[PDB]
Amino acid sequence: HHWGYGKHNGPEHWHKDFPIAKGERQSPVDIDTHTAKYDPSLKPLSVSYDQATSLRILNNGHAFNVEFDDSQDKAVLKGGPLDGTYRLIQFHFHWGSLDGQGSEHTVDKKKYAAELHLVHWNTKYGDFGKAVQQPDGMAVLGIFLKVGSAKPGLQKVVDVLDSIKTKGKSADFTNFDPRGLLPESLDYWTYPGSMTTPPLLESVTWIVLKEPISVSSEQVLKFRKLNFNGEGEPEELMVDNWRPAQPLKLRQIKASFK
Ligand SMILES: [Zn+2]
Numbered sequence: 001h002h003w004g005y006g007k008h009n010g011p012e013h014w015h016k017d018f019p020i021a022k023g024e025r026q027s028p029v030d031i032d033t034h035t036a037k038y039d040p041s042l043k044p045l046s047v048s049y050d051q052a053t054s055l056r057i058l059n060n061g062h063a064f065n066v067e068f069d070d071s072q073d074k075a076v077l078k079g080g081p082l083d084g085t086y087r088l089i090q091f092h093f094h095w096g097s098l099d100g101q102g103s104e105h106t107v108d109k110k111k112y113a114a115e116l117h118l119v120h121w122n123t124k125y126g127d128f129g130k131a132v133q134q135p136d137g138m139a140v141l142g143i144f145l146k147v148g149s150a151k152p153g154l155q156k157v158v159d160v161l162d163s164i165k166t167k168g169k170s171a172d173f174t175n176f177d178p179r180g181l182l183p184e185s186l187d188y189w190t191y192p193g194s195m196t197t198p199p200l201l202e203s204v205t206w207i208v209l210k211e212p213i214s215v216s217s218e219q220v221l222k223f224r225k226l227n228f229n230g231e232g233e234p235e236e237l238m239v240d241n242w243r244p245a246q247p248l249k250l251r252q253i254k255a256s257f258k
Contacts, residue, residue, distance in 0.1 A: 027193035086120035148214035153180020
């Protein structure tokens with residue numbers, strides 16, 4: 001068919017259809033905390049999600065996406081490394097088959113159980129399709145998940161996963177508040193990178209939060225019960241849907257904090 005995360009269609013194969021896979025600004029990366037430098041000129045992040053309008057949750061065969069209404073400025077990210085206004089369009093996760101793997105970014109080679117991506121696009125380009133073709137078209141807010149206490153703000157997501165078990169299934173998901181997925185601190189690392197899935201476009205300002213959120217073993221277990229396959233197809237559990245760390249290539253990772 002096309003791309004995925006298995007032995008036969010996974011990250012080692014992506015470069016054949018998407019040669020930018022071997023480019024100069026690919027993501028994810030390892031964040032070396034000893035080499036990242038505090039940038040005193042970086043602003044605090046402004047996460048403005050009060051008017052966020054969620055719509056729908058969709059199993060797309062790679063992950064699940066929670067989609068938002070991005071027709072107007074309702075949920076936006078501004079400040080930090082960003083110029084202008086980036087609209088929230090969707091969030092999704094990457095996760096592992098085991099608690100010691102699943103994040104895309106790593107911190108001093110440490111892998112987290114999962115990683116949340118809140119995906120935003122630059123309103124100066126008018127729509128998301130145009131924005132993804134621009135070097136400053138996207139901003140993705142990345143948050144690590146470790147296994148611990150349950151995250152109450154995640155539970156409505158966990159609750160609905162039974163209803164979108166297989167690829168192509170969707171469900172109504174209105175009135176979800178993405179603010180409940182955030183850790184306390186908005187300290188972050190930032191670097192220029194790419195989409196971590198095909199088409200791997202080099203169009204993302206990455207903003208990765210220093211503080212992970214804690215989720216429960218039961219919560220991540222339910223993510224692992226999803227399927228990559230469509231209904232009526234042989235079951236393949238949706239696990240290990242992460243790309244490993246890519247060469248930094250002399251990009252610099254900046255820290256918002258001392
Ligand atoms: Zn992602």
